[PDB]
PROSS optimized variant of RhlR with 61 mutations
Amino acid sequence: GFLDWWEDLRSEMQSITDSQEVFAVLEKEVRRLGFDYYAYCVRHPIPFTRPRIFMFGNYPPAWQEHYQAQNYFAIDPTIRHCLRSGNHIVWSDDLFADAQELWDDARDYGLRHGATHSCMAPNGVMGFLSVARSSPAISPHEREELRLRMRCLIELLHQTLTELNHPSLQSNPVCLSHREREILQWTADGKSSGEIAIILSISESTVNFHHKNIQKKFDAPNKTLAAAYAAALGLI
Amino acid sequence: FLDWWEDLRSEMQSITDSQEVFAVLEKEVRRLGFDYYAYCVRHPIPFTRPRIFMFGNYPPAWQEHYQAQNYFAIDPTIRHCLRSGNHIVWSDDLFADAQELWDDARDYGLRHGATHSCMAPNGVMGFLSVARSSPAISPHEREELRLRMRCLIELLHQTLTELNHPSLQSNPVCLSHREREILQWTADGKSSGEIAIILSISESTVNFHHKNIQKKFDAPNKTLAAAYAAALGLI
Ligand SMILES: O=C(CCCOc1cccc(Br)c1)N[C@H]1CCSC1=O
Ligand SMILES: O=C(CCCOc1cccc(Br)c1)N[C@H]1CCSC1=O
């Protein structure tokens, strides 16, 4: 029973105390769902041009090398920060219309049917979980139950890797003060350094002082990087 | 169980009226063992006064007592924060920094409940609450409640987007394939001049797309454009 599985998986997961044991249980659950291999990809929101991306999975090592050789992560439609209709998408030739060399290479290496689920933590980090198999296509009868079963896996995996303080989830910690924060919302809302100084009734000589410290907490050359990074991290 | 979720999907997909969706929702909140509910949409922008819509069948005395205290500003259950599981059961400790809200809430009979939040990638963060007075939420029904509520708010967000409700919609801003690359570099702290070197363009043309981006966001400077676009998932 789904709930018995959920409960038995939860008690089994909270019992884990190491980072390689969680992927072992995950591998056992992917086969339980009727699939052969999995893939977990964590995508941080910054830097906006080359975002930090971590990838773990038990795909065949031949594909793992081919994939890394072609930089397929740059054009993979299954790990793009998009708006999946249900945070979930079943692989189809339409999904890979703008990436035919990847879909052609994938089915060749035996990954002919699969699906990817995406969760977005409200701290910018997005998570992806893919499952793949060779012979049996995804039957419409098992589609929904697959969609629900994977949403529990990704969320559980996200929560337990967070509780274990995994590095792939730990982002650069930014200590923003309540006054510093309120200025940065005004900056990000388009107000100039002079305009800000009149609402808070402070000096322009001190709104730039706070800016100089916010930029130091983001290692920012300008305010733009600070305001944009803060918005992406949910810090404002 | 599964048979319930499957049967619930048929009722919603058949709905062709917004009020009919809230009606079916209310019937589900009763099935969970709760009297009242409340759904909330929190848009990310503006950063100083975000757009917030509120609906729910709370008692009328509370709704106009809630909105008369500006309680939406100090309510922990609608904070743009990272819940341990997109979920938190109400407790005296949860409302430590908002005691006037919790004391009034218990006085008015909203003594037991839980809130569940979903973060749509459009920057919108939806929240769903359920409340009752008599029976405390016992530890044995918690995890089953966390599951049933996650399904209820996901199907609620979707069903409401497929109906084009102007609570879920945000101001469109179609960004060009290159304007998006420029704003990404700008958002990464690069200057209008440095950007021209990376892409092999003229500073006048970098400063030319900027003028169009800030026009697409109604922005005074580049900082509003970069920050707004980052909040909406556009860069
Ligand atoms: O599963 C995913 C998620 C991103 C790629 O994940 C990978 C790929 C190769 C090695 C490793 Br490790 C992870 N994408 C699919 C698209 C079709 S083939 C494929 O890898
Ligand atoms: O659920 C929430 C916040 C979201 C709903 O807010 C409200 C409150 C009153 C009328 C309406 Br409509 C929405 N807060 C809880 C916790 C304390 S008592 C309460 O209403």
About this structure: Residues A 39, 41, 55-57, 59, 64, 67, 76, 78-79, 106, 111, 128, 130 surround K5G (ligand 1) (CB under 6 Å). Chain B touches chain A through 50 residues (CB under 8 Å).
